[PDB]
Ligand binder design. Sequence first.
Ligand code: HEM
Ligand code: HEM
Ligand code: HEM
Ligand code: HEM
Ligand SMILES: C[C@H](Oc1cc2cc(F)ccc2nc1N)c1cc2c(cnn2CC(=O)O)cc1-n1cccn1
Ligand SMILES: C[C@H](Oc1cc2cc(F)ccc2nc1N)c1cc2c(cnn2CC(=O)O)cc1-n1cccn1
Lengths: 141, 141, 146, 146
Amino acid sequence: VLSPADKTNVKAAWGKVGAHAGEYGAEALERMFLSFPTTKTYFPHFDLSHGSAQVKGHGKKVADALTNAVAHVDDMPNALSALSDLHAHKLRVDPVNFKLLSHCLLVTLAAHLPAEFTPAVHASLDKFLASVSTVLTSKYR
Amino acid sequence: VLSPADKTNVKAAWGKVGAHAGEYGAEALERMFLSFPTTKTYFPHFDLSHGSAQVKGHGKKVADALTNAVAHVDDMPNALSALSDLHAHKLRVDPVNFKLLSHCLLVTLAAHLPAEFTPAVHASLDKFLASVSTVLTSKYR
Amino acid sequence: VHLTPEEKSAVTALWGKVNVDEVGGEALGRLLVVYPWTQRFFESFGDLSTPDAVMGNPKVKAHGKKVLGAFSDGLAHLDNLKGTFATLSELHCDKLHVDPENFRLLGNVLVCVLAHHFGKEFTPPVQAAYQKVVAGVANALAHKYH
Amino acid sequence: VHLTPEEKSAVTALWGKVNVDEVGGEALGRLLVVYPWTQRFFESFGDLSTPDAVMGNPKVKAHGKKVLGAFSDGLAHLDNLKGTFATLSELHCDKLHVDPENFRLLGNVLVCVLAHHFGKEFTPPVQAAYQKVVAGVANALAHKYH
Ligand code: HEM
Ligand code: HEM
Ligand code: HEM
Ligand code: HEM
Ligand SMILES: C[C@H](Oc1cc2cc(F)ccc2nc1N)c1cc2c(cnn2CC(=O)O)cc1-n1cccn1
Ligand SMILES: C[C@H](Oc1cc2cc(F)ccc2nc1N)c1cc2c(cnn2CC(=O)O)cc1-n1cccn1
């Protein structure tokens, strides 16, 4: 459950990503695949080599979905309904993998946006990614 | 995130719980204290002996809060706001303990309401208790 | 696993009354219904699309009996759970990549099934003894991660 | 924990550049801010009521340095993490009853702090090597939960 300060912090830190959505998402995915190799099992059909156009294209989609989540932060079960159908009903992703990708997203933000990554903002982003993860891993439709 | 079927299953099950809500709450606490003794560290001020009036009284309060959660299942952040302040800000309960109490509640319901405790209802109740646990362990004011 | 003599006697006596044809299948079925991502590991079982399809699936019933056999093996070797579950830990951890939190979930669903079958006879002290057993089995199954 | 010679060199080189007065305190401070229930274990530290109060607290800074020293001890004994962390496992598990998921959380907050301090030099392969280390430390600290 996000506080009003959390939503303010998330809108501010996420908005700073801007035109670099693809770069951040793709690096978070690369960090996840290298750090937690079992996560590769969900992407047998991807070219996972470094700098793969497929991972870049997917990173942009992941980042754009989080931007959509921020734009509808109080209505995520409706805004993300198609993503929940995909991750919960079709792919059946184990929720541990969402903790892994969320951690890799925080690591990417810490590395590339140091001034924005304050302890309060880190806390708010972690809560936001946990809320998004609950929506994407729950079958509510 | 609860589905419409989840909310229906929980309302139907907790209605069958009925007058025994308080008794089930006290048994779930007793099961938690015996099965996971580290949970006793939150209650140094309680008489935790079997059939303690204190545990019975507390079980009724816990069960009444869950009844309130069922009655306001789509507005739990507001309905449980005082309880989230108590558990998340004052007591600082580690969220693992909510998984422990939730499990003990499910065990109590399975033992006492076998006909109602179908796999679909068990699934809905587990999701409902996870959602209540998220509200009570989050600082959102 | 450190069980008191009275807990060891209670656990053994309840276990002897378990319906071996039903309990394992109900525990595995409930895991698949309650934690639906676990179905990803059982694509060879076919239809698992509804609770009724899961519970009536003969592969769930047969596999559940094998799982129940492994918990039985645990109860017979409470002093050497790591050794007992060594090859099974290698299968789940290195070959299947099952996240170990799922082992805790199955242990707890089994406890719910035991409560469902035994009712009020699945007392808080009997449960406490079973919680020590299922925690032990879950930890032994996770031992081959590192 | 197994690190390749390349990973061992990369991990050691970055670790040598860690600001010992800041990194441990930032990791512990961030744990207290991000996972606020962890504050229950640190009542003796006084004011932890706001992120600024946590981050400026000298007890958090001093205790964080001891935690950083324990991770450093882990890096010096990658072949014997269980042995290295035996007394700290007794303290955390047997005396304090810290749930072991919190050890994984602190390991991961430390990795966030290393990324925050090192920026682009905290590359995905360097992170992967550090993830093996922190998982090893967390598992070794959790050893006494049996
Ligand atoms: C914040 C968490 C996540 C978000 C926002 C997210 C978002 C997305 C989006 C937007 C798509 C593309 C949907 C489309 O084009 O119709 C997608 C696909 C997918 N996601 Fe996720 N995802 C997340 C976490 C995960 C995790 C943790 C895994 C597994 C480790 C995962 C595995 C997949 C896979 C396998 C696909 C299909 C890829 C393809 O075939 O193109 N996702 N995800
Ligand atoms: C579904 C989960 C839970 C619910 C609905 C719940 C509900 C309640 C309620 C209604 C109160 C009394 C508030 C008042 O009278 O003003 C309370 C108090 C308390 N709860 Fe919880 N609780 C839950 C879980 C937990 C857990 C997991 C723990 C710790 C293991 C815990 C520890 C406490 C403590 C220490 C108090 C204060 C008791 C006292 O001094 O009277 N609660 N809880
Ligand atoms: C925690 C308690 C568990 C026990 C005691 C257990 C026990 C077993 C046993 C005895 C086997 C058969 C070994 C063989 O025939 O080679 C087995 C197979 C397997 N287990 Fe588990 N298991 C547990 C948890 C899990 C969980 C949580 C999952 C997945 C979420 C899982 C997935 C599997 C799969 C996929 C197989 C192979 C099935 C096949 O042959 O198609 N197990 N398990
Ligand atoms: C996972 C990595 C961790 C490491 C390497 C670690 C390391 C340490 C060290 C080296 C000590 C000092 C021991 C001494 O002076 O005898 C310590 C004390 C302690 N740790 Fe940890 N710790 C970890 C995680 C945690 C977590 C997650 C918590 C609580 C959430 C925690 C709570 C404490 C407390 C309360 C003490 C005693 C502090 C005091 O003396 O007041 N630790 N830890
Ligand atoms: C709209 C949402 O609504 C819910 C979020 C929930 C999150 C669960 F984790 C569990 C149940 C939830 N139920 C909601 N109604 C919500 C309502 C909130 C707060 C804080 N107070 N309130 C009430 C109020 O402002 O009037 C935070 C959120 N929130 C949005 C995203 C994540 N959390
Ligand atoms: C009111 C609540 O609102 C939220 C619950 C949330 C739960 C998070 F875990 C995270 C974010 C949430 N945001 C909400 N707005 C909610 C809205 C839902 C569904 C299913 N669809 N919808 C949308 C719709 O009916 O129009 C389920 C819930 N729900 C209530 C209790 C638990 N979940």
